């Protein structure tokens, strides 16, 4: 927009006595001082422009309740904004602030303040003057400390300080008894204040990517917690039965910490959670009976730990829908796996399995089975009953042949057999109606392909690189999968 077009918009706003002025997304460099005549405005939108300064005449808009300055190049604000005694929402995200503008601390009518993605380094004590703040966002700045005066914001409900450099929280934070959403992800927190337990309305606590080595015992008093994310810290234990007290917990993440065991407390601590993430720790066992009360537990991730076997009652996890045990030291899957009738995803990558239990074929709803990077020397005939299976990953195992029953996997679309010892594929491969991707690359003993492979009418991706295939015409295999399938098709019994 040119200066004249902006003035035309102001004049239209005046003539129509409009209470809303939207000048966003116009590449405006200068806001003309003529804005002073629009005293009836309650909402002024100027986001996504090129403003490097705001005219002091904006202070004449005494009726303003919303001022959005997002995505400009502002470094300051005129002191005349003192006169906006009714301002409720101020958005200064995506500017060039090295500080909270001095005048903002005097806008004590504010209930919503967005400072996200600037270069602010300090939160002055004067923050106490904004006692009506219910939503405060200082996400993605350079703040290294919060003043104790933050505890005077007793109406604070949502506080987002994600992506800063905080090492501690002032204990006075416990005076914000209304806080229900607290995001502290990606800071440098060494600990949490014991007063944190005062936040009895806290429902979401984001703490991923910090430096916590322990959780305060008083966190058990935040009984409204539904989402607790402790990913990537330095925690090895949880205080006595902390989880048992979180009666609304829906999902818990302990991944990327220092746990050698499950937190002590028994099955009472998992009675409500829907998903449990413990990947990338050093847990050496799943306790017997810890899920006996986990009636809604649907997703368990134990990837990259120290499991050498599964618990005796493994077969009782009838509500489990997604289970990840990759990168452990499992040498066998118990036959009791047949009890996981709700399991749809099973990840067993990078273990020490040489064979699979017969009970695997009872997982009637299993859709994804990842077995790459094991030592599998064969597949059980029971796999024929995995009728819901869509993806089967067997990359880098020791398979030489496939069970003929594999032809009953009519829902299978992805079959990854790369880096195996296959000598041939069963003729029943032709009944894989929905097969789309067949990876056979790096099978140095695979000298043939069955003509029935031409019957897979949805096959569009196949890799045979580094497969001998010496039983097929050399010029055929030299042409790649397109000529190979063509040969099997028009040279076979099914043309």
């Amino acid at each position: 927009s040119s200066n004249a077009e902006v003035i035309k918009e102001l004049n239209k706003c005046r003539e129509e006595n409009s209470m809303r002025l939207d000048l966003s997304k116009r590449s405006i460099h200068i806001l003309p001082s003529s804005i002073k005549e629009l005293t009836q405005l309650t909402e002024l939108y100027l986001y996504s422009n090129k403003l490097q300064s705001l005219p002091a005449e904006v202070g004449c808009l005494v009726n303003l309740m919303t001022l959005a300055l997002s995505e400009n190049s502002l470094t300051s604000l005129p002191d005349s904004l003192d006169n906006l005694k009714k301002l409720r929402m101020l958005d200064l995200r995506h500017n060039k602030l090295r500080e909270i503008p001095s005048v903002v601390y005097r806008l004590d009518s504010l209930t919503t303040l967005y400072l996200r993605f600037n270069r602010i380094t300090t939160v002055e004590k004067d923050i106490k003057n904004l006692s009506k703040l219910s939503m405060l966002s200082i996400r993605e700045n350079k703040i290294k400390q919060l003043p104790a005066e933050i505890g005077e914001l007793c109406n604070l409900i949502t506080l987002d300080v994600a992506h800063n450099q905080l090492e501690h929280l002032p204990k006075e934070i416990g005076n914000c008894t209304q806080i229900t959403n607290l995001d502290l992800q990606h800071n440098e927190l060494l600990d949490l204040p014991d007063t944190i337990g005062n936040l009895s309305s806290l429902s979401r606590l984001g703490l991923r990517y910090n430096r916590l080595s322990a959780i305060p015992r008083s966190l058990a008093k935040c009984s409204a917690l539904e989402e607790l994310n402790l990913e990537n810290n330095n925690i090895s234990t949880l205080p006595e039965s902390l989880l048992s007290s979180l009666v609304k917990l829906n999902s818990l993440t302990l991944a990327r910490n220092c746990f050698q065991l499950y937190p002590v407390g028994g099955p009472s601590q998992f009675s409500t959670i829907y998903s449990l993430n413990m990947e990338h720790n050093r847990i050496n066992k799943i306790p017997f009976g810890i899920f006996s009360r986990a009636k809604v537990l649907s997703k368990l991730n134990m990837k990259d730990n120290q499991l050498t076997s599964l618990p005796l009652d493994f077969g009782t996890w009838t509500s489990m829908v997604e289970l990840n045990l990759a990168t452990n030291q499992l040498t066998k899957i118990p036959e009791d796996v047949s009890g996981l009738v709700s399991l749809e995803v099973l990840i067993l990558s990078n273990n020490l399995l040489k064979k699979l239990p017969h009970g695997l074929g009872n997982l009637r709803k299993l859709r994804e089975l990842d077995l790459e990077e094991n030592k599998l020397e064969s597949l059980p005939n029971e796999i024929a009953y995995l009728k819901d299976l869509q993806k089967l990953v067997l990359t880098n195992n020791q398979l030489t042949t496939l069970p003929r029953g594999i032809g009953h996997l009519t829902n299978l679309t992805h079959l990854g057999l790369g880096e195996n010892l296959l000598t041939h594929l069963p003729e029943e491969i032709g009944t894989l109606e929905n097969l789309e991707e067949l990876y056979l690359n790096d099978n140095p003993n695979l000298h043939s392909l069955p003509f029935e492979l031409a019957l897979c009418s949805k096959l569009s991706i196949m890799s045979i690189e580094n497969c001998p295939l010496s039983h097929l015409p050399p010029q055929i295999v030299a042409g790649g999968p397109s000529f190979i399938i063509q040969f099997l098709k028009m040279q076979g019994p099914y043309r």
Binding site: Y47, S70, D91, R93, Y114, R116, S137, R139, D160, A162, N181, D183, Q185, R204, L205, G206, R208, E227, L228, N229, E231, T253
Partner: peptide, 14 residues
């Protein structure tokens, strides 16, 4: 969650 500006916040606990 998506804030009024359309940006996401509280990712990790939403």
């Amino acid at each position: 969650f998506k804030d009024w500006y359309g940006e996401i916040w509280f990712d990790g606990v939403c």
